[PDB]
Design an enzyme around this catalytic site. Structure first.
Site, PDB file in Angstrom:
ATOM      1  CB  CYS A   1      -4.796   2.078   6.653  1.00 50.31           C
ATOM      2  SG  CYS A   1      -4.485   3.578   7.591  1.00 50.31           S
ATOM      3  NE  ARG A   2      -4.946   1.585   1.214  1.00 46.27           N
ATOM      4  CZ  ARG A   2      -4.597   2.283   0.131  1.00 46.27           C
ATOM      5  NH1 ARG A   2      -5.342   2.307  -0.977  1.00 46.27           N
ATOM      6  NH2 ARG A   2      -3.472   3.008   0.174  1.00 46.27           N
ATOM      7  CB  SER A   3      -0.256  -3.547   2.845  1.00 48.19           C
ATOM      8  OG  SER A   3       0.418  -2.450   3.403  1.00 48.19           O
TER       9      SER A   3
ATOM     10  CG  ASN B   1       3.488  -1.485   5.363  1.00 48.45           C
ATOM     11  OD1 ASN B   1       4.636  -1.776   5.759  1.00 48.45           O
ATOM     12  ND2 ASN B   1       2.514  -2.379   5.358  1.00 48.45           N
TER      13      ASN B   1
ATOM     14  CG  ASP C   1      -5.987   5.866   2.032  1.00 48.50           C
ATOM     15  OD1 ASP C   1      -6.323   5.425   3.244  1.00 48.50           O
ATOM     16  OD2 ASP C   1      -4.981   6.483   1.798  1.00 48.50           O
TER      17      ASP C   1
ATOM     18  CB  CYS D   1      -1.188   0.074   0.975  1.00 45.23           C
ATOM     19  SG  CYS D   1      -0.729   0.195   2.713  1.00 45.23           S
TER      20      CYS D   1
END
Length: 157
Positions: free
Chosen positions: A17-19, A15, A129, A12
């Protein structure tokens, strides 16, 4: 039990929130299917802005809500990532463009880079996001990740 060793890097922008969500979900899948010994898993960022940082607290509590934990520290994607991982899965088109660009500076790039959402049985290509969103947005990200990660695993398993 004996196979070959595979690897996936979730990516992301930050690195944070998402990944970290994808990565943690994925470790859990593998763990539940008794195949951890054959997987190398990791997550990274396009950006260096957040290196060393722990995951957004909303991501941590979202995972916790689902019985999952993480100890991830944000790190940047590097050149060796492209020669060491089987797959590089990212969240959105921007990450995709960004990785493709870098990978170019890579001679023997052996990683396959794709949108994680390309694995979504529901076809929601992009993983939005959630940084400026709220708790429900995180939850929806978790949900997408679950679908995509199960789908991915079933095909390279």
């Amino acid at each position: 039990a004996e196979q070959v060793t595979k690897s996936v890097l979730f990516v992301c922008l930050g690195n944070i929130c998402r990944s970290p969500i994808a990565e943690a979900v994925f470790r859990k899948l593998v763990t539940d299917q008794n195949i951890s010994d054959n997987w190398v898993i990791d997550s990274g960022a396009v950006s260096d802005w957040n290196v060393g940082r722990s995951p957004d607290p909303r991501a941590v509590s979202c995972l916790r809500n689902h019985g999952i934990n993480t100890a991830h520290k944000a790190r940047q994607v590097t050149k060796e990532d492209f020669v060491t991982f089987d797959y590089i899965l990212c969240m959105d088109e921007s990450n995709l463009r960004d990785l493709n660009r870098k990978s170019n500076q890579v001679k023997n790039c052996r990683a396959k880079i794709e949108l994680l959402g390309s694995y979504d049985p529901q076809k929601q290509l992009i993983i939005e996001d959630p940084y400026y969103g709220n708790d429900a947005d995180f939850e929806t990200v978790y949900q997408q990740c679950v679908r995509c990660c199960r789908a991915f695993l079933e095909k390279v398993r």
